[PDB]
Every structure is written in structure tokens, then in C-alpha cells.
Design a protein around this ligand. Sequence first.
Ligand SMILES: Nc1ncnc2c([C@@H]3O[C@H](CO)[C@@H](O)[C@H]3O)n[nH]c12
Ligand SMILES: Nc1ncnc2c([C@@H]3O[C@H](CO)[C@@H](O)[C@H]3O)n[nH]c12
Ligand SMILES: Nc1ncnc2c([C@@H]3O[C@H](CO)[C@@H](O)[C@H]3O)n[nH]c12
Ligand SMILES: Nc1ncnc2c([C@@H]3O[C@H](CO)[C@@H](O)[C@H]3O)n[nH]c12
Ligand SMILES: Nc1ncnc2c([C@@H]3O[C@H](CO)[C@@H](O)[C@H]3O)n[nH]c12
Ligand SMILES: Nc1ncnc2c([C@@H]3O[C@H](CO)[C@@H](O)[C@H]3O)n[nH]c12
Lengths: 230, 230, 230, 230, 230, 230
Amino acid sequence: ATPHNSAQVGDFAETVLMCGDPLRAKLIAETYLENPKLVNNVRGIQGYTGTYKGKPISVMGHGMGLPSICIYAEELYSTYKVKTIIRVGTCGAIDMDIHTRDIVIFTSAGTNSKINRIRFMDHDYPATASFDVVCALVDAAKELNIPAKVGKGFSTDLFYNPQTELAQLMNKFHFLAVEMESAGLFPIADLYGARAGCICTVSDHILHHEERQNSFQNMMKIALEAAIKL
Amino acid sequence: ATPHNSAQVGDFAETVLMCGDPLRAKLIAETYLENPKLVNNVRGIQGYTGTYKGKPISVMGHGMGLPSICIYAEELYSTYKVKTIIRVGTCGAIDMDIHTRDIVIFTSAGTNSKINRIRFMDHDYPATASFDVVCALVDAAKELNIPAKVGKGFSTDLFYNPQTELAQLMNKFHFLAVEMESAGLFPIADLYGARAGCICTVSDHILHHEERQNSFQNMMKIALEAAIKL
Amino acid sequence: ATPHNSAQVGDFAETVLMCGDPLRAKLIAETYLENPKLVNNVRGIQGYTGTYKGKPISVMGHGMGLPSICIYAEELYSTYKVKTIIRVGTCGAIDMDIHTRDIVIFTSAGTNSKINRIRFMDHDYPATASFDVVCALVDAAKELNIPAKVGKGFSTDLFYNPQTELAQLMNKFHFLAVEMESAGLFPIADLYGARAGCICTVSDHILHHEERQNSFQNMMKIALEAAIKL
Amino acid sequence: ATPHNSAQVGDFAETVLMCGDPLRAKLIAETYLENPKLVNNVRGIQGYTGTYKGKPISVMGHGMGLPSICIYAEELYSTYKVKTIIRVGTCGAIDMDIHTRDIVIFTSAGTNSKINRIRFMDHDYPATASFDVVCALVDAAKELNIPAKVGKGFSTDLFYNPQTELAQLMNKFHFLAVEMESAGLFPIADLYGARAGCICTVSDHILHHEERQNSFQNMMKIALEAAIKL
Amino acid sequence: ATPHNSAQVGDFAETVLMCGDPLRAKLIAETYLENPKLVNNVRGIQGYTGTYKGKPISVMGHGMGLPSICIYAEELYSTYKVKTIIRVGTCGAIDMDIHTRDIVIFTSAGTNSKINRIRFMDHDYPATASFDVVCALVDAAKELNIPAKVGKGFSTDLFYNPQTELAQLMNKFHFLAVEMESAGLFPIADLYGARAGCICTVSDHILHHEERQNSFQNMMKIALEAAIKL
Amino acid sequence: ATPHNSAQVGDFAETVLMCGDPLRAKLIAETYLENPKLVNNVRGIQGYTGTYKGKPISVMGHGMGLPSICIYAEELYSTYKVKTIIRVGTCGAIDMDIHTRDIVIFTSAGTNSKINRIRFMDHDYPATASFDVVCALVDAAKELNIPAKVGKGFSTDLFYNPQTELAQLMNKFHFLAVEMESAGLFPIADLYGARAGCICTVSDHILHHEERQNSFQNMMKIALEAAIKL
Ligand SMILES: Nc1ncnc2c([C@@H]3O[C@H](CO)[C@@H](O)[C@H]3O)n[nH]c12
Ligand SMILES: Nc1ncnc2c([C@@H]3O[C@H](CO)[C@@H](O)[C@H]3O)n[nH]c12
Ligand SMILES: Nc1ncnc2c([C@@H]3O[C@H](CO)[C@@H](O)[C@H]3O)n[nH]c12
Ligand SMILES: Nc1ncnc2c([C@@H]3O[C@H](CO)[C@@H](O)[C@H]3O)n[nH]c12
Ligand SMILES: Nc1ncnc2c([C@@H]3O[C@H](CO)[C@@H](O)[C@H]3O)n[nH]c12
Ligand SMILES: Nc1ncnc2c([C@@H]3O[C@H](CO)[C@@H](O)[C@H]3O)n[nH]c12
């Protein structure tokens, strides 16, 4: 149906969990979904659809960077009529009080990208996570009683950032972590009157980089349960 | 103590409700606070401190525009050691599904101002409301069972906006309303490791402008109760 | 008539003196105007109209910041058909040769605001004071023989400026002082084919902060006489 | 060795051909390389190393978008000491005189991304292809006598571009096609004193979208031969 | 002494009149100066020094565009210790009330150039003419009783401006005319604590282009007399 | 025919060599052209037309700066129907491996100017030299066996650059030299579906400034021969 998706309308669940790593998405499909079926693998993207506790749910990779997830997210809402996209994955801690292996739920995401300024008449668009998804993710975290920090994230265009001072500036403003997609995903959801959210497990710390899967499985539990709540 | 505040450290409660209209703040102090005392009136700003259900609370005007509230907010967190600032007031509906007299709770605020880009190395800072305050405001709204829409707000520098197309662009992205301070307030709270939030009652609709105090008193109830919860 | 002015067309003189402090405006009305009448107090803005040496003249507060004065100024020219707005007030010296208590007449004003770029296709708009008003203010200063420095001003959006290097950069370019409205006022006057100007008394020095009312009364004399000349 | 590459220094040839589609890279490795060995598959990126006409050569996917290829390209030059990266792939024709199935060799690439402005003090960096690689690609095209258009490319951040007028603007300036990586790749090569180039086969036309593999195999022949020449 | 001036310190008068056309400068030197001597002709720039009513005065071309006059102006203030530069020349009327052959005295100049933003931390620098020079030029105009309009000018980087809407926007803001140097000249004078001004004769109208030398000689009279006053 | 050219269509050859210095252009016309005739001298621009090895060719000055060459270049392509403009001249070495007296052929040019962003919807336009002209210039250099470096150039708006760090940033990215026109010339050629190129002789080094005509005559030989090839 699309240049990046061979699947047809209906093959994707109304709720899709996405992570950058396509192999991670395959793993997630085999590990948590029941009767998972490969619905799209254009570009090895590993798009699957199965069920969790009886409900339809899909998992697919989204690549790295705002331009990448923007392609997939817009096609999903627009063509495959998806309603909710929960980004799942890793990120780099910024705040000194945030440590590796911690779980973070984004309320919103800043960015050094130009995409949102392009779509918003060169103004400041607040890439905000859908309050529904934020609440569902936090409640899931509370019900499962899994500690999770909630707050600002930062979607960078440069994993290897030349502006070495930015890290400290963000720490002063208490940004929790850095990843590379949220800032792009959120506004697209708004455009389609749909929902988006993000939950990540800190894989490294950018201000002083210091059992890893345990944190990941917990994050997955939260995303999954939150998906059902939604 | 400051160029805009005659009061001294301790005169202000750790939680302050602020609105643009200084007379509105005087009214709020006389109407909802017990034993309200004028603690600052530099520039007729009408800063009062009293109690609500036994707890210390202050109300003060903040003028109109990001530059204005930025002055007051930074002095409060920094000098008067305030912990929470809940902006209370009016705003203009953008979204067609939002009508005059509706109540809106901001998750965040976009802006055509340059302030946040100045403080954030010319990047996109997501002016986000403190998740605690957003939750407190929403729960108060739920407990009081008062309908309130939650979502993106927009803090403009131009009440009379030359860019007449912006209104429709924002409606496409589902921004709820427009006011003139939130985008400035939120980042300052982050800088001081403190909290900020905003709740407004739609006084007009910018896309087709269509009992007004009733909506205001309800909004005040929510802000007040949320203040206690915090 | 307007969301910020209860007065009607004709209640305001064709020449209005404005300052940020509403109480200062009340003081000015009681101290220099004859038969002053409160014509607008929406938001405690303290708008009065009286006469000086027989001629009709109004004084009103304009709040702090470009967004604030922009609201008032545009309503005045547009709705109340005002012809001349002379901003009166305080400011912070930048230039080392300018000392506290000095009087400054702005030829123009720079700014870190985005407003003028928004109204001028993202280009450099030179927020310039009306040559008539500049001349009237300087001549008044000469006739009264009151020393006054004439030159560039700077309208900041951040009273508490994070960019601490800006102050020195401006001193190198010989900006006289900093305030928070002129840059917004001037272009609006141009749009309405009307006039605007600004005269301030240095209340503090930002590069080395070092009887204060005496300087203020002198500034007021100049503004007042210049108003008559216009 | 890197967060995105499991391989070690020496596993990659000094010349690497990269395309967005990881499956395409696997295909290229199986189809044109002799004794291809998977040297990196972190994130299913499909990184192989084999030989072409006796010389060492690697092929790897780079994902979609500037942020993506920027990660891979910088790690390759920096860590794996790669000297030449030739981007191979598809693109969308812009120019009316360019038709689907045509082959294009980029002299340089424009972009709506902010990455280059971030690394170049907010100025205009001309993302230029290494003259050596451009010449090698063109000579290969001449020696093989395969028609190929040479000129400007455009690396977009938005496959689905909101600014629908851009396409025509680019056609007026005679940009040949649009893809999503070149603009990011070129400057990185410059930084490492290394080389980069790009050759694409038009898969679609954005101004009037109108046997496809034949054009692809030809493009591959050129890239491959040019690699040997380098 | 400089890469663009063969003359040495002292060869130039402290007051220099400059125009874009080098032949025009030669003409001005032969027509109004007594005992004019060629002090610099690097690049055929036609730099002369002579006397007017006994006082030392120099005239030199400055080429077209901000980058050009910026070179000459900075070398003059810095190396040749010039104190006052009065730009003399032609310009294009913008305002409908301004007609060809009219004379205009710039209070300041806007611009679509990036130079001032580069030297002013990306903010809005108000390219303002030295109040002394503006006054000297206006008084000369009054004493000679030669009608001259005073107000905003615009220094464009594009004589052939792609943005065809700008002309009307500027007419709404009442910009008097357009030329290509003032915006660059003024800030440089500020930097050197020196003076600069500009007076032009409208040679064409950009909104409806409609004896020409007569207007020029009048403009020259004003510049010359103003030079003596300074 | 134009405000800057007295000549008429046909007076200029389809190939024109341009340099900033008008006297240099006169010299070039007298030194290398046969039967050179002055076809335009508006503003002492020194525009000549003659023949080289029997073919029609014109040489004209273009002043200093992008705004300047932009005027001349656009009039030439548009009005005088010129097909190829080869910029000839001097420049300042940036790269440490480039020394005074070296010859440089630009593949493209970066810039701190705003012109290209104005004509390209505020995006990154890659000011690229026509591949034909680059090839013709390089082949001429090869056939004459005259060493010449090929690569990125930088067209500055500020000969005296306040941003002293830029020089080192450019050296890290391996920009060869700096001049003041190329970035403006290239995009104009693209707009008119015509060709442009640039070849310069390093007159100074900006990172450590260290027989000069010999290098110039060699550069001229290359430009001239390349002109014939085109
Ligand atoms: N410290 C970090 N910085 C940027 N991105 C990431 C990530 C995520 O993984 C990828 C970068 O490695 C990308 O998809 C991003 O979302 N993990 N850690 C990161
Ligand atoms: N439609 C509207 N647009 C912008 N601001 C406001 C407001 C609020 O009141 C003031 C503008 O009238 C300002 O403080 C803003 O926060 N109400 N309605 C508004
Ligand atoms: N040093 C300073 N910086 C900025 N603004 C001001 C002012 C004026 O008073 C207010 C800031 O205190 C604001 O209205 C501004 O115009 N005085 N001194 C100032
Ligand atoms: N019309 C088009 N627009 C943008 N990118 C592409 C492409 C390439 O394929 C991906 C987008 O589909 C991305 O990697 C880009 O480089 N092909 N066609 C394209
Ligand atoms: N309509 C116009 N637009 C831009 N510049 C000018 C000029 C002046 O002459 C040159 C442009 O022709 C340049 O130096 C500029 O200052 N005259 N008329 C102009
Ligand atoms: N180091 C340098 N920096 C900038 N421009 C130049 C030039 C050329 O000569 C003029 C500046 O002197 C201008 O036309 C530019 O293209 N030579 N050396 C230069």
C-alpha cells in the first residue's frame, strides 16, 4: 500500500508499539505477542501483528532519527488507520539524578531538528505526548509498581553532537534523556487527531556514562499494559 | 527585595496563583482567601497572601506577555523560594470543538516568542507544564466532576496577530487555546527545579467568536483544590 | 470598546504618555495634569485624560514587555484614533559613559524579540522613533536646557538575560540603555501612519550599577513640553 | 566496537557502498560481491565485506534520513578507518526533464535539515560530493557508456513534505532529485578528510509520477567500477 | 595601507562623502571640490581629497551592496581615522507618496542582509543614522529650503528581489526608499564611535515607476553644507 | 539596456570572464583579448568584448560582494543572453595545506549571506559550480599541467569577520579559500538554466598569512582555455 509498507489496511492493529531496532521488534513480537504474524518487512522493518491478552496489537521498527519515524508514523495513521503509537526503546540519560537502567516516560520532547519549525510556520511547536498515553503509561507503571521517571525528553538529529555544551544546558533544565524520534512522532499524531507516547530505558548516560534486560522487560510490561488500558 | 516586589522572603506562600489582571487577583484574594494580606503592590501588581483551607497561599498578577510573567516567575522561584506557580486566567479557543466558557488545562504551550530559543541554544524547547501540576489540576477537575479539556496551548507575542493563517494551522494540529504567558513560565520552573501549570477559561473563540463567571468560579475551584493537593 | 479598554472613541487625547508602572501613570496624572479623569482602568491600567497648558492629553500604563505595550498601542492608534504616543519611564544604562539618573532619548531600539521579524517577513526592521517626536523631545530638552543623551536603546524580552555577553556587545556598539517596550511601539506607529517616541531616566546600570525623582521630573518636563510642541 | 556496529577495525573495506534498504544491501552483497561475509548486523543493518575484481569492498544499509546515515558514516570514517563511502540507492525526480528510471550523480545536495547549520555556525554549508568520487562515478558512466545526469540533489527531512510549493521552487533551480541522506554524508566526509559520493536511480517523479531493476543494475555497475577506480 | 586603499593615514579628510558609482565620485570631486587630488584608485574606486569652503573633504566610491561599503567604511574609520561618512546617491522609492526625483534623508535602514545579525548575536540591530548627521542633513535642507523627506530606508541584498510581496509590506510600514549600503554603514560607525548618515535622490519607483540632475545637485548641496556643519 | 549596463543584446559574448577589480578586467582585456572593445562602462565597470583564439569573449568587473555580482550576473543571463560566466580573481586561503600563490577551482561555495536562504524558502541551497565549467577548468589545468586545488570555497559578507572562530571551523571542514561572490553567482546560473564557475589565485592566507603575477597569468590561462572548451 505504501512505499515502505507492503501490508494493507486492516493488517495493523489500532495500537502499534515501535522501536528503532527491527530485530528488537522481532524479538518483542516473538516474546510477548501470541500468534504473531509478519505483516510488513519492506526494508527489513520487521512489522508484526498478533495479540496481547486477546487484543490486536502490532509491533514494528521505525529506524533511527526523526525523518525515519516520521515516514512510518504518518503512513500508519493515514493509510493503516492506526490510532495509537507507543514508542518503546532506549535513550541516553542527561540529568545527573537519572542513572543507566532507569525507565523514563516522556511528557514531551525538545529537538535540534527543523521539522517541527517547517510544519509550524517557523514557530515553537511543543512536541507533546498524548495526555491519554502519558497517563496510561504512568498508571501501568503505578499498578505494576515499577519506578519510572516522568518528564522532558530530547530528540537529537546528531547522536554525535558537535555542540558539547548542549548536554549541560539540558541538565540545567532537567531534561531526563535523549533519543531520536519522539519530537517527530508527537506532532504527526496531533495532525491526524490520533495518539502517541514514548517510554524508554536508559542504556547510557551522556554526562558520565556508568541486568540491562531486566529494565527492558519492565519497560515492555508497562507499554503492553498501557496499550490494553488504551 | 526585588525591582518588582517590595515583599521579603517568607511573605509569599510556596504556592502562588497568578493571572494577568491585577484586579482579578485582588478579587480572587478577597473572594477565596481567608485573612488575605497585601504583601506586594509594586506597579499595582496586587500581590496577596492568605490561606485556603488552612494552608498558606498567595495570589498575584503577572501582567500580559511572556516577558512580563518571566520577570515575576523568576523572582518568585529564585528570591521568594516559591515552589509552585499555577497560572489562572482566560484564553482564546482555537480548536473548533472548543467553545467559549470551556475550561482548558495546558499540558504544554507553543509560542512565536524567541525567549525559549534564546535560553535553549536556538533549539526547540518544549514548554511543558509540570506533570505533577497537570495531574493535580486534572484530578481536582475529576473529583469536582467539572468538564475540562486537556492539551496544547499557545502563548503568543501578538494578541493582534498579522499572520492570519496561523490560527487555522493551529486548529489543524489541535491546539486548544491561546494566551500569553505559559510558554515563558514553564521553562523557568524547570530551571529552578520547581513547578508550574496553567488552567484557563475560554473567554473568546478566534476562529468564529460566539454565565461567564460561572465558568471562572469553576476554574478557580479546580486551581484552588489542586493547590491543596500539591 | 476593546478587550483592554472600557473607554470610547474620544475619551483619549490624540497624544498619550505611557509608562510601564500604572501607579506611576496615576501619579503623573495627579501631579502634572489639570482636571484629570479616569477614562480606563481595565486591569488597573490607570488610563487618565486631562489637560496640560490647556491642551488635551492622556496618560496610561502599558505594562512590561513588547507583547504588552503592543496591545495597548495598537488599540490606541486603531480604535481611539490616537496620533502620538510618547513612552516615558525608566531603563538600564549599558554604555559606560551613561550613569544612573541620566536621561536618554531613543532614536531607535534594537531587540531580542521575534515580533518585528514576524511582521517584517523575517527581515531586519529598524524600530525607529518618529523623527518628529525625537526632534520635539530634543528641542524640549534644549529649550529647558536639560542634558539628555540621544541614541540607540534596546528592548529586551528577558529582564534577567541568560546571555551575559550581550551587555558588553551592546556597550561596544554604544547602545545607551535597555528597557522593554520601544522596539514594539515604533513599528506599530509606522503601520498606522502615526507617531511614537521614548524618553527614559536611567534607574540602574547593568555593567556596574552605582535625587532619583529629580531626574524623573526633568524627564517628565521634557515629555510634556514636547507633547505640546507636537 | 560502536553502539551500532559489532565489527572491529579492519572488518570493513576502505570503500563502502551504502543504501537505505538493508535487504537491498544484502542483495547487493550476494549479487555482486565474491565471498561476502556478514561483518555487522546490529539492528539488522546487513553489513557485509567481500571483494569485487579482487579488491576489498563492503556494503551496508544506512537507514532513512540524515540523522541515520550520519551515525553510520561518522563511525565508519572515525572508528573503522573507512576512506570512501559511495551512497547507492533510489530518489525522486524533481526536474521535469528527469524521468523515472533515470540515473543521477549528485554534485552536491541541498536540505531542509538543520544539521549542517548546527555544525557550521548557522551558516550555509555546501554539502558537496568529493570531486574525486564525482569524477570516478562519471568516468565509470562514460566508460560503460551509461547515460547519467549530473547535478544537484536535495536531502529532505520530510518524505511527506507539508511545503508543497518547494517541489516547484526546486524545479525552477533545476535540482535533479530528492533523497534523504547525501546532505548529511558529505560534510562528515569533509570533517574526516575522507571521501563521499552518491548515485541514485529515479524510482518516482514528485511533479507528475509516471524494467526498473535494469536501471538499478546499471547504477550498481557504475558505483562498483567507480569504487575500483578509487 | 589597506588591501583596498593605497593612500596613507592623513590622505583622507575626516569627513568623506561616498556613493556607489566611482565615476559619480570623480564627477563630484571635479564639480564641487577645489584642488581635488586622487588619493586612492585601487579598483578604480576613485578616491579624492580636496576642499569645500576651505575645509578638507574626501569623496570616494563604495561599490554596490552591504559587503562592499562595509569594507571601505571599516578601513576608513579604523585605518584612515575618518570621523564622518555621509553616503550620497540614488535609491528606489517604495512609499506611494514618494515620487521619482524626490530627496530622502534616512533616519535608519532595514535590511534582508544577515550581516547585522552576525555582529549582534542574531538579534535585531537597529541600523541607525548618527543623530548628528541626520540633524546636520535636515538643517542644511531647511537652511537651503530644499524639500526632503526624512524616514526609514531599506538596504537590500537583492536588487532583483524574488520576494515580490516585500515591496508592498514596506509600503504599509512607510519605508521611504531602497538602496544597498546604509544598513551596513551605520553599525560600523557605531562600533568605531564615529558617525554615518545617508541622503539619496529617488531615481525610480518600485511600486509604479513613473531634470533628474537638478534633484541630484540639490542633494549634493545638502550633503556638502551638512558636512561643513559637522 | 539595464540600470548597470549601457550595452545592448549581442554586445556581450556568450562567455564572460568576471573579476572584482574593474582595472584588472581592463588589464585582462588588453593583455589577452584581440581587438577588445569597451561595450559597457556604467559605473566604471570596464566591460569589454573581444576574441580569444578567434572566439567571441567578454570580460567585465563585478564589484565586491554577493549583492554586487548578483546584479551583473542576473542581467547578463537574462538580458544579454550570456550562457557562461567564469569568475576569475583572488581569494584568501583557509586550509593550512593551501599556500599563497596557489590556484583554486571551486566545486561550490558556502556563505554567511542570507541571499540563498531568501531565494530557497529558508533552506540550505548548495551553491554549486556548473559541473561542465568545473570539468573544463580542471581539464584545462591538466592539459596545461598547472597544479590547482579543487574544492569548497566560502563567499563571505564580511571581509573583516567579527566571528574569529569561523576560520578554524572552516579549516576543520577543509574549505580551500574565501572570496565574496561565488555563492551568489552559482544559484543565479541555475535559475537561468545557464552555467557558472570560479577559479582563484590565493593572494593571502587568513590563518597565518605568509612572483604573484605568475600565479595569476597561469590562472588566466586556465580560465581562457576552459572558456574555449566550453
Ligand atoms: N544516548 C543516546 N543518544 C541518542 N539516541 C539514543 C538512543 C536511541 O537509539 C538510537 C541511537 O543509538 C536512536 O534510535 C535513539 O532513539 N539510545 N541512546 C541514545
Ligand atoms: N484570545 C486571546 N489571545 C491571546 N491572549 C488571550 C487572553 C489572555 O488575556 C490577555 C490578552 O487579552 C493575556 O494575558 C492572555 O493570557 N485571553 N484571551 C486571549
Ligand atoms: N535595566 C533594565 N532592564 C530592562 N528593563 C528596564 C526598565 C523598565 O522597567 C521595566 C523592567 O523593570 C520595563 O518596563 C522596562 O521598560 N528599567 N530598567 C530596566
Ligand atoms: N521521492 C523520494 N523522496 C525522498 N526520498 C526518496 C527516496 C529514498 O528512499 C527513502 C525514502 O523512500 C530514503 O532513504 C530516500 O533516500 N526514494 N525516493 C524518494
Ligand atoms: N531601486 C533601487 N533598488 C536598490 N538599490 C538602488 C539604488 C542604488 O544604486 C545601486 C543599485 O542600482 C545600489 O548602490 C543602490 O544603493 N538605486 N536605486 C535602487
Ligand atoms: N582573504 C579574502 N577574503 C575575502 N575576500 C577576498 C578576496 C577577493 O577580493 C575582494 C576582497 O578583497 C573580494 O572581491 C574577494 O572575492 N581576496 N582575498 C580575500
